[PDB]
Amino acid sequence: ATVNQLVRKPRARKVAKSNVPALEACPQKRGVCTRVYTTTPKKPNSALRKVCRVRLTNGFEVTSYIGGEGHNLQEHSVILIRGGRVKDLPGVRYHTVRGALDCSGVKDRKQARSKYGVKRPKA
Amino acid sequence: GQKVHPNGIRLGIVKPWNSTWFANTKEFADNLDSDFKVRQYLTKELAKASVSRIVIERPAKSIRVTIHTARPGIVIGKKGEDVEKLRKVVADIAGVPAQINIAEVRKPELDAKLVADSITSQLERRVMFRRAMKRAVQNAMRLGAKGIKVEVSGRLGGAEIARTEWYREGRVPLHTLRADIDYNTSEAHTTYGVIGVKVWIFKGEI
RNA sequence: GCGGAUUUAGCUCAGUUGGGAGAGCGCCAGACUGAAGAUCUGGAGGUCCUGUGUUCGAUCCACAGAAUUCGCACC
RNA sequence: GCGGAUUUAGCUCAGUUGGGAGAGCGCCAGACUGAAGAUCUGGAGGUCCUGUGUUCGAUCCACAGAAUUCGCACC
RNA sequence: UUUUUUUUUUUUUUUUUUUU
RNA sequence: CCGCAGAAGAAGCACCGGCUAACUCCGUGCCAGCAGCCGCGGUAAUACGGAGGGUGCAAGCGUUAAUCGGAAUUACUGGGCGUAAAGCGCACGCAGGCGGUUUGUUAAGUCAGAUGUGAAAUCCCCGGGCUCAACCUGGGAACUGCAUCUGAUACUGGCAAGCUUGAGUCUCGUAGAGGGGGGUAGAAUUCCAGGUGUAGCGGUGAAAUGCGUAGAGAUCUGGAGGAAUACCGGUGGCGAAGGCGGCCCCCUGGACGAAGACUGACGCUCAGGUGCGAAAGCGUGGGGAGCAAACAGGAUUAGAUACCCUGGUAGUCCACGCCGUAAACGAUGUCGACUUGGAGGUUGUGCCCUUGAGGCGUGGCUUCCGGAGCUAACGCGUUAAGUCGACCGCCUGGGGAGUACGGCCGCAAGGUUAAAACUCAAAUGAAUUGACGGGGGCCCGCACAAGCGGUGGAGCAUGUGGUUUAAUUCGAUGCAACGCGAAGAACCUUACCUGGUCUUGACAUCCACGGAAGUUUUCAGAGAUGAGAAUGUGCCUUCGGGAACCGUGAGACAGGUGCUGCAUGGCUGUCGUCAGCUCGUGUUGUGAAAUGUUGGGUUAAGUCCCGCAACGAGCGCAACCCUUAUCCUUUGUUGCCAGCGGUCCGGCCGGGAACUCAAAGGAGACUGCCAGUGAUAAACUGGAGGAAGGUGGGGAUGACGUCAAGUCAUCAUGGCCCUUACGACCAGGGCUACACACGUGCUACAAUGGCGCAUACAAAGAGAAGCGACCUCGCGAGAGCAAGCGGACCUCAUAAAGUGCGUCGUAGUCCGGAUUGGAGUCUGCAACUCGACUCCAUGAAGUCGGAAUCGCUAGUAAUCGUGGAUCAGAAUGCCACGGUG
Incomplete structure (x- = not known):
């Protein structure tokens, strides 16, 4: 009831705190794959997830999550960028709808329908 | 926060028994045992007009069965053929005769x-x-x-x-x-x- | 048409062209403890991305195929 | 190399005729606390560096040896 | 309107669904 | 459009929480993951992720980039100023806003009209053409303003006229803690020149560093310095705030009580600025008491880097001046009209035979606190928030901030605009908590008292830790846990280490074909179970069907303390012997506030007189109880003996009913009457009278409220267990070590003791899976004989103290059973590396232990014993009543 302590976390369970800095135009964008990483020891033992950096002109350096299945998301590519920074990721402030170019994304996952854009199976 | 029986704690004071019978020292066990079974049978016979009071007296171990139901006329039968039946199947378990008396739920x-x-x-x-x-x-x-x-x-x-x-x-x-x-x-x-x-x-x- | 490096325990990666391996994090556990931590101890985790042949003996080699990737032959 | 301190309680260190092993502190008990420290009263805590000799008796001293360590020698 | 008899005691996890 | 030919050729995605909307069967473990406000997932995930069905809707379905929705917000049209945010300590005047209100007049704005603009697709209405939705459209209108003019006059502004006198200057009076310079009245007390009394003065939760035969102050007399306002002083006076305390001389603030005179709005109220400016720095030179931050230590030390206490400056104040400035809040300006008011606190004043405490008046300064309204809950109730208004304002939501990046000012520090990168999720206020609380206060309990007995150090009976052993079984870790559950972890209700059988198993059914049920050894086997040899043949009796009672073969089909208190009901607890709460209605509180606890008093007491808007409804209440204890009748009981009858000396056996006893029905003690107490209330004391006394004692019931505590190991059962299993048969064994403790429980340290011989009295209990005397053999554990005895008959106590006479002589013993030499036993498959007790040899610590874990207030702990169950059985656990005390 002492509001300066109380306001931080109190009874909501979506808890609205999200930190999403930087602007300079709009959030829905194209993002160059610049330079790949898979470095950094953390608590979530993140496996095979190549989380790379993007050359966004925004006043500081930034990074993006791999946004969906399909292992090849190479360093020469340029995908779409959007919000959705799961609790799992430090530093990053976006994810990616990544089956543009040659990077493919969903392979034969019949269930994916309107969520990614796949065609029908054997009826 | 309590469920509290007014009944049972006060048998002599406007709330009469479900059973009043007398077995000595050794003879209690098969009486009591039968006191679930004849009760079981009677209620599944009676359920077409239920049973308000199901009164097991035992004048000499043999059983003066006294049954309050809303409609006696369906356990009397077309007059007497279910009164034969009941008196058979309530004596059978006990090994001793069982005098099936009705009453009407007033x-x-x-x-x-x-x-x-x-x-x-x-x-x-x-x-x-x-x-x-x-x-x-x-x-x-x-x-x-x-x-x-x-x-x-x-x-x-x-x-x-x-x-x-x-x-x-x-x-x-x-x-x-x-x-x-x-x-x-x-x-x-x-x-x-x-x-x-x-x-x-x-x-x-x- | 080039052919080279990195891929190691669940992660990170030390280091390794033949005797087939290594640390922390994380994981589980014998208790203390309702469960953990203070105090006090224990177990691992893989034949180093893998498969045919070498070879007395493979992560290693010859050799093909996978992942991270590289600039040039590409027009 | 010569001279010197030094290997004396977890921690800082006192100590020696040459025969006891010490204290602030730390632990533990006694209780005061549900508990613990303080503060308390009792118990306990030693590679006395090793060897040798003097000697009643060496932690000590002298001698020889290890090993740290300090100044000066070196220009 | 003099009000220091010692200062400290880790996170949890309690929490019997729901529209009325 | 009209015949053939066929339902033919035409549909699906979100998904399924909850928003409009339909839910489950399952998965992977804050994995992977949607991420809009919410919500989901932290091995039981209703939409994450799979799947079954179905749903919203159907060329559609979710969702996305922005932004207003709902939501009221930049408000001439639309507003909140106790709140978010919110009248900025302060107003010298320069422009600006409102300029007093009506006559005669005027229509530029005001408003209505006539006429022009807005050809055509609007917005808003109808009529229609296509088959028609649409589409294609035509017709009907409405357009604030601006133009050009006709009018109608109530405002807006003016014009001529006048006033209401807003505004001042004179005239005339009257006091205070004075805006700035002047004059300056008076206690203490330092420390000295010398006048003295000798050792003690300050200071504290306890005192300290100076000091004292080179005399601790103080106290006179003689002197040298520093310069508060102590009060006629206030139950008060002034002032723009601030802010001065004595009174006075000058400059003479403001005022403001008045005969009036003279001019007629010269006015109010203000931003940028003008002055003023509490805290503080800059000063520049000092005025340099007493106290007290820093200064300087003595001291209280878990570090004080401290607070004391002597010593200590700055603050005291300020000539003079950049001073912004924050707590100077009707959480609030400018104010005129407001005329139910009525009550005080004060000031000046009109009128009274001033026979007078002020009577009749009446403004100002101030507070009190009053209807209609307004209205949450406190109540505010007209000058106050309800009407009516002139603005100089502030008011742009989190978090960005009091912040900078141009320069206006400032002596530099800063003042002051209060902008903005970007970011992101609600709360400030009430009012309600009560945290377990060395509050004020009421208390009270071994909390604490006064005190009694002790636990301790060494040795002993022993369960974790921890040694690490070959290898280790749960859960035990303050008040909610101790001797585990285990009251017998070596057949034992089996953990567990195993091995030997099984998974309808040991136990128990409904039909199918059949059987008479059992006694006795021999050899195997660790037990379960294996291989043989003999002896037996029941009751109805339809000779049918079966019983007692044993079989093999069918289909159905068997089980276990596995914890959650959280589906719930019993039950038990420490709180509780408080006189309980909350409610059927009511209603002040929207609701968490209890709403009888309030307002006077009265009792130790929610005691008892009343009152108060409070009833009363019944489950706690009112008390039924058990044992007393004293007796009353009927009694006499194995009991049990008054008074005599025999004595062969034992209530023995005659012999009768006093009382214990045994005991059923039951019964009697009340302020009863006496003195003191005060209100002849209260009740508290002693006592008549008593077997208790003011519940007489001891048991007992143990209401709501009971820790989110249990009985989760019989509970009773809802949600959920493992089932090749947590299901059931059977022989072994090993828990105890030992360094460590630490205690619970045991004792040994000698005369208020025991030791040796001899003497006086009770009983509490349990008792045919029973308990057993006399009496035989005895060094005795322990053998035998057996009367008896079912509930005073049999027996197990012949409590220990105490008392009379002897012996040690303070002495490690004569006492210590720590224990170890040998000897034996009651059972048993069983005790030995495993006990439990007995006979004789002996003799480990022993000599009065500190600290600091609570026993125990009364007939109660030292002191003084005997019994019981679990169970083929050895607890020191605990459990309950007697008695020197």
């Missing part, structure tokens, strides 16, 4: 029990018995009583639902060993789980 509306057998019948229709539950209590209360409280616990909704509801069509002095009060029960199912109704019928003061 208007079911006023009774020590039949208020619970009306409400638990409705759960066999499987539709929304709530339309008929407060009603069937308030009807029986125009034909007798001064207060009643009624409790239903059970599976009364759908899929995973178990909850419990409480209702008061008059005041209830909860234990009073001088008053005309009755506590009682009855038990239903609805293809999901139990529906067990209980009553406290504050009929009168003394």
Whole structure:
């Protein structure tokens, strides 16, 4: 009831705190794959997830999550960028709808329908 | 927060027995054993007009069975052929004769029990018995009583639902060993789980 | 048409062209403890991305195929 | 190399005729606390560096040896 | 309107669904 | 459009929480993951992720980039100023806003009209053409303003005229803690020149560093310095705030009580600025008491880096001046009209035979606190928030901030605009908590008292830790846990280490074909179970069907303390012997406030007189109880003996009913009457009278409220267990070590003791899976004989103290059973590396232990014993009543 302590976390369970800095135009964008990483020891033992950096002109350096299945998301590519920074990721402030170019994304996952854009199976 | 029998604690004071018999030292065990079985059989015969009081006397181990039901004329039979039958199957377990005496439930509306057998019948229709539950209590209360409280616990909704509801069509002095009060029960199912109704019928003061 | 490096315990990666391996994090556990931590101890985790042949003996080699990737032959 | 301190309680360190092993502190008990410290009263805590000799008796001293360590010698 | 008899005591996890 | 030919050729995605909307069967473990406000997932995930069905809707379905929705917000049209945010300590005047209100007049704005603009697709209405939805459209209108003119006059502004006198200057009076310079009245007390009394003065939760035969102050007399306002002083006076305390001389603030005179709005109220400016720095030179931050230590030390206490400056104040400035809040300006008011606190004053405490008046300064309204809950109730208004304002939501990046000012520090990168999720206020609380206060309990007995150090009976052993079984870790559950962890109700059988198993059914049920050894086997040899043949009796009672073969089909208190009911607890709460209605509180606890008093007491808007409804109440204890009748009981009858000396056996006893029905003690107490209330004391006394004692019931505590190991059962299993048969064994403790429980340290011989009295108990005397053999554990005895008959106590006479002589013994030499036993498959007790040899610590864990207030702990169950059985556990005390 002492509001300066109380306001931080109190009874909501979506808890609205999200930190999403930087602007300079709009959030829905194209993002160059610049330079790949898979470095950094953390608590979530993140496996095979190549989380790379993007050359966004925004006043500081930034990074993006791999946004969906399909292992090849190479360093020469340029995908779409959007919000959705799961609790799992430090530093990053976006994810990616990544089956543009040659990077493919969903392979034969019949269930994916309107969520990614796949065609029908054997009826 | 307590359930509290007015009945049983006070047998001599307006609330007579379910059984009054006498076995000595060694002879108690098979009497008592049979006192569940003849009771079992009788209630499944009677259920077409229930059984308010199910009175097992034993004048000499052999059994003066005294049965309050709303409609005697269906256990009498077409006159005498079920009175033969019952007297056979209630003596058989005991090994000794059982003198099947009837009585009529003097208007079911006023009774020590039949208020619970009306409400638990409705759960066999499987539709929304709530339309008929407060009603069937308030009807029986125009034909007798001064207060009643009624409790239903059970599976009364759908899929995973178990909850419990409480209702008061008059005041209830909860234990009073001088008053005309009755506590009682009855038990239903609805293809999901139990529906067990209980009553406290504050009929009168003394 | 080039052919080279990195891929190691669940992660990170030390280091390794033949005797087939290594640390912390994380994981589980014998207790203390309702469960953990203070105090006090225990177990691992893989034949180093893998498969045919070498070879007395493979992560290693010859050799093909996978993942991270590289600039040039590409027009 | 010569001279010197030094290997004396977890911690800082006192100590020696040459025969006891010490204290602030730390632990533990006694209780005061549900508990613990303080503060308390009792118990306990030693590679006395090793060897040798003097000697009643060496932690000590002298001698020889290890090993740290300090100044000066070196220009 | 003099009000220091010692200062400290880790996170949890309690929490009987739901529209009325 | 009209015949053939066929339902033919035409549909699906979100998904399914909850928002409009339909839910489950399952998965992977804050994995992977949607991420809009919410919500989901932290091995039981209703939409994450799979799947079954179905749903919203159907060329559609979710969702996305922005932004207003709902939501009231930049408000001439639309507003909140106790709140978010919110009248900025302060107003010298320069422009600006409102300029007093009506006559005669005027229509530029005001308003209505006539006429022009807005050809055509609007917005808003109808009529229609296509088959028609649409589409294609035509017709009907409405357009604030601006133009050009006709009018109608109530405002807006003016014009001529006048006033209401807003505004001042004179005239005339009257006092205070004075805006700035002047004059300056008076206690203490330092420390000295010398006048003295000798050792003690300050200071504290306890005192300290100076000091004292080179005399601790103080106290006179003689002197040298520093310069508060102590009060006629206030139950008060002034002032723009601030802010001065004595009174006075000058400059003479403001005022403001008045005969009036003279001019007629010269006016109010203000931003940028003008002055003023509490805290503080800059000063520049000092005025340099007493106290007290820093200064300087003595001291209280878990570090004080401290607070004391002597010593200590700055603050005291300020000539003079950049001073912004924050707590100077009707959480609030400018104010005129407001005329139910009525009550005080004060000031000046009109009128009274001033016979007078002020009577009749009446403004100002101030507070009190009053209807209609306004209205949450406190109540505010007209000058106050309800009407009516002139603005100089502030008011742009989190978090960005009091912040900078141009320069206006400032002596530099800063003042002051209060902008903005970007970011992101609600709360400030009430009012309600009560945290277990060395509050004020009421208390009270071994809390604490006064005190009694002790536990301790060394040795002993022993369960974890921890040694690490070959290898280790749960859960035990303050008040909610101790001797585990186990009251017998070596057949034992089996953990567990195993091995030997099984998974309808040991136990128990409904039909199918059949059987008479059992006694006795021999050899195998660790037990379960294996291989043989003999002896037997039941009751109805339809000779049918079967019983007692044993079989093999069918289909159905068997089980276990597995914890959650959290579906719930019993039950038990320490709180509780408080006189309980909350309610059927009511209603002040929207609701968590209890709403009888309030307002006077009265008792140790929610005691009892009343009152108060409070009833009363019944479950606690009112008390039924058990044992007393003293007796009353009927009694006499194995009991049990008054008074005599025999004595062969034992209530023995005659012999009768006093009382214990045994005891059923039951019964009697009340302020009863006496003195003191005060209100002849209260009740508290002693006592008549008593077997208790003011519940007489001891048991007992143990209401709501009971820790989110249990009985989760019989509970009673809802949600959920493992089932090749947590199901059931059977022989072994090993829990105890030992360094460590630490205690619970045991004792040994000698005379208020015991030791040796001899003497006086009770009983509490349990008792045919029973308990057993006399009496035989005895060093005795322990053998035998057996009367008896079912509930005073049999027996197990012949409590220990105490008392009379002897012996040690303070002495490690004569006492210590720690224990170890040998000897034996009651059972048993069983005790030995495993006990439990007995006979004789002996003799480990022994000599009065500190600290600091609570026993125990009364007939109660030292002191003084005997019994019981579990169970083929050895607890020191605990459990209950007697008695020197």
